[PDB]
Nucleic acid binder design. Structure first.
Ligand SMILES: Nc1ccn([C@@H]2O[C@H](COP(=O)(O)CP(=O)(O)OP(=O)(O)O)[C@@H](O)[C@H]2O)c(=O)n1
Ligand SMILES: [Cl-]
Ligand SMILES: [Cl-]
Ligand SMILES: [Cl-]
Ligand SMILES: [Cl-]
Ligand SMILES: [Mg+2]
Ligand SMILES: [Mg+2]
Ligand code: NA
Length: 328
DNA sequence: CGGCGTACG
DNA sequence: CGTA
DNA sequence: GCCG
């Protein structure tokens, strides 16, 4: 079992679901307390279990697995012995965990804001709604639409949405393309949002594209919220049709030049942990700096000109993983 | 012990 | 600060 | 919290 998640295939569904869920609760709780190192270890340990070929049934099967030390091993041991881990259950039922989870789930609220509200004594969404002068416009939209945004986006919703985006994109810039990325490209059947990557086959034509796209979507009445109602990423709330009505859904749009498209596609297809691990691997094992724009050799001061995701994996000395195996 | 991904709005 |  |  290699130490980096980008070195091993991780499928969407696996053989250790309950164990990984429990470790991800501890990871999440670590993040709510600002303990980024512990969050990473618990996320990595959970991801190792997702990559195993069969269920863990005995503690000895953790021997030699990376990212399993005394703490994560004890969590697994208790789950194996009793079906429950006391530390995990104590987190689950704690007021701090439940409120931080509720608040950070709001679009426009991060850990730092949630924590401040928590220390001010706030606990429920209706607490926040009662003091709306404390809220940014982004947070007001996230709170108003919170109920719809808490319901999963279905993969069967995505194609109709993509067609609507493609219509606006084609009027903004004929020939520009829309590619589904994020969790749905990794094979998820449901998601929290839809992530689209936009480009154009003629380098430079994509300059200034996203404002034109957003203005067209807003003119069609489809945008319930966006930040601009020059930029290259938009985080918006979209009106999605429903039987006799509609629902709010989160849609992310990003524009990249076609020269960068492999890097952007890789960078936006995820998972989030896979990307963190891939960039850590690149820098720490290969001495190369990776982001969603490119891959930089700081000694030569040169950028690698990739034509595909396959190119990028090869340049990093990694076996290619299709999106479905990037579910770290 | 240091390090923990890297951007954009 | 928020967002991916 | 864990790895190198
Ligand atoms: N911090 C981050 C957050 C996001 N990303 C990248 O952005 C993509 C969409 O994130 P996203 O937030 O839409 C989560 P997704 O994987 O699509 O599943 P979901 O929407 O059903 O929950 C991820 O797959 C990563 O490639 C990242 O590199 N670093
Ligand atoms: Cl920490
Ligand atoms: Cl409607
Ligand atoms: Cl590609
Ligand atoms: Cl980036
Ligand atoms: Mg997504
Ligand atoms: Mg997204
Ligand atoms: Na949030």
């Amino acid at each position: 079992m290699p130490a980096y998640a980008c070195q091993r295939p991780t499928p969407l569904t696996h053989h250790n679901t309950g164990l990984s869920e429990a470790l991800e609760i501890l990871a999440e709780a670590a993040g709510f307390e600002g303990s980024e190192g512990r969050l990473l270890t618990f996320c990595r340990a959970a991801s190792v279990l997702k990559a195993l070929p069969s269920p863990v049934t005995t503690l000895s099967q953790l021997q030699g697995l990376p990212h399993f030390g005394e703490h994560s091993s004890r969590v697994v041991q208790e789950l194996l012995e009793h079906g429950v881990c006391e530390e995990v259950e104590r987190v689950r039922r704690s007021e701090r965990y439940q409120t931080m989870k509720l608040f950070t789930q709001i679009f426009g609220v991060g850990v730092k804001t949630a924590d401040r509200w928590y220390r001010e004594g706030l606990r429920t969404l209706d607490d926040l709604r009662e003091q709306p002068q404390k809220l940014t416009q982004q947070q007001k939209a996230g709170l108003q639409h919170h109920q719809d945004l808490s319901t999963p986006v279905l993969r069967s919703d995505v194609d109709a949405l993509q067609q609507v985006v493609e219509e606006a994109v084609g009027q903004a810039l004929p020939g520009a393309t829309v590619t589904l990325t994020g969790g749905f490209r990794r094979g998820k059947l449901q998601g929290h949002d839809v992530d689209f990557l936009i480009t154009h086959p003629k380098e430079g034509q994509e300059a200034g594209l996203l404002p034109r796209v957003m203005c067209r979507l807003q003119d069609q009445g489809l945008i319930l919220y966006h930040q601009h109602q020059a930029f290259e990423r938009s985080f918006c709330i979209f009106r999605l049709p429903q039987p006799g009505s509609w629902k709010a859904v989160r849609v992310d749009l990003v524009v990249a030049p076609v020269s960068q498209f492999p890097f952007a596609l890789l960078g936006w297809t995820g998972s989030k942990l896979f990307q963190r691990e891939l960039r850590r691997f690149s820098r720490k094992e290969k001495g190369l700096w990776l982001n969603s724009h490119g891959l930089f050799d700081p000694e030569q001061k040169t950028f690698f000109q990739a034509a595909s995701e396959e190119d990028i994996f090869r340049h990093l000395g990694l076996e290619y993983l299709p999106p479905e195996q990037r579910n770290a």
